[model samples]
Target: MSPGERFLDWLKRLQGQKAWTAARAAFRRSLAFPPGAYPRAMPYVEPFLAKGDWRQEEREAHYLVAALYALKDGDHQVGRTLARALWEKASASVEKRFLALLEADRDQIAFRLRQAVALVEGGIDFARLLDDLLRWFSPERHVQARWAREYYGA
Candidate 1:
């Protein structure tokens, strides 16, 4: 198999594993964004959810960074229904992208997202953000100084 194809197949195998799938499910379930932000709130909701139960201290650190991004770019409907929709759609879409990225590189994707989440919350000690960022296409990398549109693209 070609290198890219081989990589994908390997990622698919990781995706199929129970631990990874459970992590994905937990990532989806834990997301809690302010209602009606729809896609906009995803930037706010996903990192928090992905932090998961095992990484207790890391959870809010990542989440607040996400929230900071949401504040910068979030559509200001200023109402509950809109906020909820924004939260749900954004969270779900992030879950989908998480799946797609995991389908590319499970270990790198998981580690990078966690690191980016940590970096954004500000206690991350690693010198350059890229040190953690080159690990995966995480959103926190884009949102560090300013919010970027594409979550994965550098």
Candidate 2:
């Protein structure tokens, strides 16, 4: 089983729990940063978007960059709003990073999400599905599973 498969299987377990609300909420919260913040940060993150096969570590890197960037004002007040709202939201930085990763390339992320969904439905290659799932799921556990090394080092 690949990381993506593992991720989806885990998600399947959480399905009936109505856990999607939490997931959706976190996604929305991550996107709450100043509308323009994502656009500005695009240049910095675009290159990393097509990174071959997605891995847990790669996902974590995406989260860290997202969380940090979301907190920054970037001469735009969006970051300020994001920081203030962060505490009130259930997103918890890690999830916010997931959104951030998407923000880096919304179109690509959207495309990938569709691909992942198709794969889990038995519509595509399992390994490819796992790769996509890993990419999508990594942001959920970014803090404990990945990015900690950088956090500790800094």
Candidate 3:
């Protein structure tokens, strides 16, 4: 299965595990920095990184996505994209936020994404989001363009 699928399945099990409460809080805390900052979240991220030769950025991406998923308490509706979810509630401030997010670079993008996902907490599409983040720096910039079109209703 895809990494996203694996992550989702893991999350599903985690919620029912004895460690759920603490692990959830750790994931929530991860938003303050990169994924590995929280030791508790390491297990959540490390298992997915096992000898697969994923870059640090790739692991961090997984970590961030996992953190966001935890931020929402794994309560999100599964199919809605961030663009559409945020657009449904777009105001001038939200628009400003979205515009900034579009331009955020690697150093700042993690925080930008944390804010965005938190803004639309419980409203993001984890599966699709994982895919986008995995290819976030693609030269094609297809993911960003798609998000823009969706947000602008183009």
Candidates in order, TM-scores: namely 0.20, 0.27, 0.90
Tens digits of lDDT, candidate 1, 1-154: 3322222233234345655544334334333432212354343335435533424323333333233222222222222221122223445555444444334443353343443342232232221222223323464444322222223232
lDDT of 1: 0.33
**2 versus 3: better TM-score goes to:** 3
Best by lDDT: 3
Q: What are the lDDT scores of the predictions, listed in order?
A: 0.33, 0.35, 0.80
Candidate 2 overall Cα lDDT vs. reference?
0.35
Instruction: State the displacement of the C-alpha of residue 105, model 1, in Å, after optimal TM-score superposition.
Output: 31
Ranking of all predicted structures according to TM-score, beginning with the best and ending with the worst: 3, 2, 1
- Determine the backbone clash count of candidate 1: 13
lDDT preference between candidates 1 and 3, better one: 3
Looking at model 1, which ten-residue stretch has the lowest summed lDDT?
Answer: 74-83
> How much is 134 displaced in model 2, in angstroms?
6.0
Off by over 4 Å in 2: 31-57, 61-154
Which is superior by lDDT, 1 or 2? Answer: 2
Candidate 3 stretches greater than 4 Å from native: none
